[PDB]
Amino acid sequence: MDAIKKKMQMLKLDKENALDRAEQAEADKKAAEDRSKQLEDELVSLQKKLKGTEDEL
């Protein structure tokens, strides 16, 4: 029925909307692991700098 058409439409579209908010969140999560990766890289380089510091000292 036309009502059935609309029903499936709002339900399926809200389903895709929820999935899509899931994946946009997942994109933010990916950029978060990215930020964590650069921060850990900087931390490791800083540790190397500190050890070289003590050796030079």
Binding site: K5, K6, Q9, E16, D20, E23
Partner: protein, 375 residues
């Protein structure tokens, strides 16, 4: 008529005319743009004997009338035809007088400026509308979607337009019109049905076959593989019950008809499929926002009631464009009324009456004033 002097909202879409009052959710008088004329001369008396037949009257009297199109792909044949159909819409269908209500109209994208000047002049002289505004249907569909970013695919009955708009800004440099539309669909289906044994030329069968397109047609996921499996396809083959009662069976044609827009080489167009036209449109503009265009594409038109455009659209664009970002199409149900809804939206706010095209401005500067008053 409402006690208030609210404006008229009329979408003269290329294929359908939808008219009503401002503040309403849906247009009240909606009719196809076909116009019927007496196929023969007058000798009888007592009834009928009327020249112009419009709306459902002509739909019922399709067989007796030569069915003609006052507009095709934007081109205007006879302004008298628009005069009569607007008279019918305003008085016999809307039961409204245009004297006391300004009119907001929507026009096909990239319509002739000379066409606008002549239509506005004949309008103002013939009618007594207090004020005027005309807008492109692209921004109207945008308003219906309510998102300032996206590329609008307007699939009318005469032209298909691709128009990119970023953050509520038109991009005419990346706007294109393609001469494929409902007319082509009916034509191609006509020749295929001719190869199926049924050969008709008249417009009644044109409406029958467009109804068939509305009901049964597919958009093939894979084309040649689906005809290969549609060789026999007893289950996949689908039938229709024509009003005369004969059962007409169609198989692969269901998804071989809309495919022509995607594959224009079937009947000889240099331009590739409409997905290529959206692709080129996207790259013409700066690289960076292109991803947003990919993710914000909108489709509008009566044809959109068919299935299969969304899946085909996304898959082919992902094939053409890198598949990092996710592409998703948005299309609200019953979007062929959406343009008219946007017209109501225009009349909703109180700034809209700052730029009504009043009678005295046209009387001062002629039609030429619109060249400075709309754009």
């Amino acid at each position: 008529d409402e006690d208030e002097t609210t404006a008229l909202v009329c979408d003269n879409g290329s294929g359908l005319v939808k008219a009503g009052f401002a503040g309403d959710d849906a247009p009240r008088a909606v009719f196809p743009s076909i116009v019927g004329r007496p196929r023969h001369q007058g000798v009888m008396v007592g009834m009928g004997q009327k020249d112009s037949y419009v709306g459902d009257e002509a739909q019922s009297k399709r067989g007796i009338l030569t069915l003609k199109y006052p507009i095709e792909h934007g081109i205007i044949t006879n302004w008298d035809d628009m005069e009569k159909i607007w008279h019918h819409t305003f008085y016999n269908e809307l039961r409204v007088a245009p004297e006391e209500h300004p009119t907001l109209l929507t026009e096909a994208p990239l319509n002739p400026k000379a066409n606008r000047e002549k239509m506005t002049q004949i309008m103002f002289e013939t009618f007594n509308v207090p004020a005027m505004y005309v807008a492109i249907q692209a921004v109207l569909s945008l308003y219906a979607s309510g998102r300032t970013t996206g590329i609008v695919l307007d699939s009318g009955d005469g032209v298909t337009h691709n128009v990119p708009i970023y953050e509520g800004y038109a991009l005419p440099h990346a706007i294109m019109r393609l001469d494929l539309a409902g007319r082509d669909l009916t034509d191609y289906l006509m020749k295929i049905l001719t190869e199926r044994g049924y050969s008709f030329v008249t417009t009644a069968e044109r409406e029958i076959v467009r109804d068939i397109k509305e009901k049964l047609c597919y958009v093939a996921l894979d084309f040649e593989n689906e005809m290969a499996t549609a060789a026999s396809s007893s289950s996949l083959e689908k039938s229709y019950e024509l009003p005369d009662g004969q059962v007409i069976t169609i198989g692969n044609e269901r998804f071989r008809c809309p495919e022509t827009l995607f594959q224009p080489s079937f009947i000889g167009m240099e331009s590739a499929g409409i997905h290529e036209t959206t692709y080129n449109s996207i790259m013409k503009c700066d690289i960076d926002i292109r991803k947003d265009l990919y993710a914000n594409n909108v489709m509008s038109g009566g044809t959109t009631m068919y299935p299969g455009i969304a899946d085909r659209m996304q898959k082919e664009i992902t094939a053409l464009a890198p598949s990092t970002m996710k592409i998703k199409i948005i299309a609200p149900p019953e979007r062929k009324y959406s343009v008219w809804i946007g017209g109501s939206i225009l009349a909703s706010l109180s700034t809209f009456q700052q730029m009504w095209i009043t009678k005295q401005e046209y009387d001062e500067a002629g039609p030429s004033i619109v060249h400075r008053k709309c754009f």
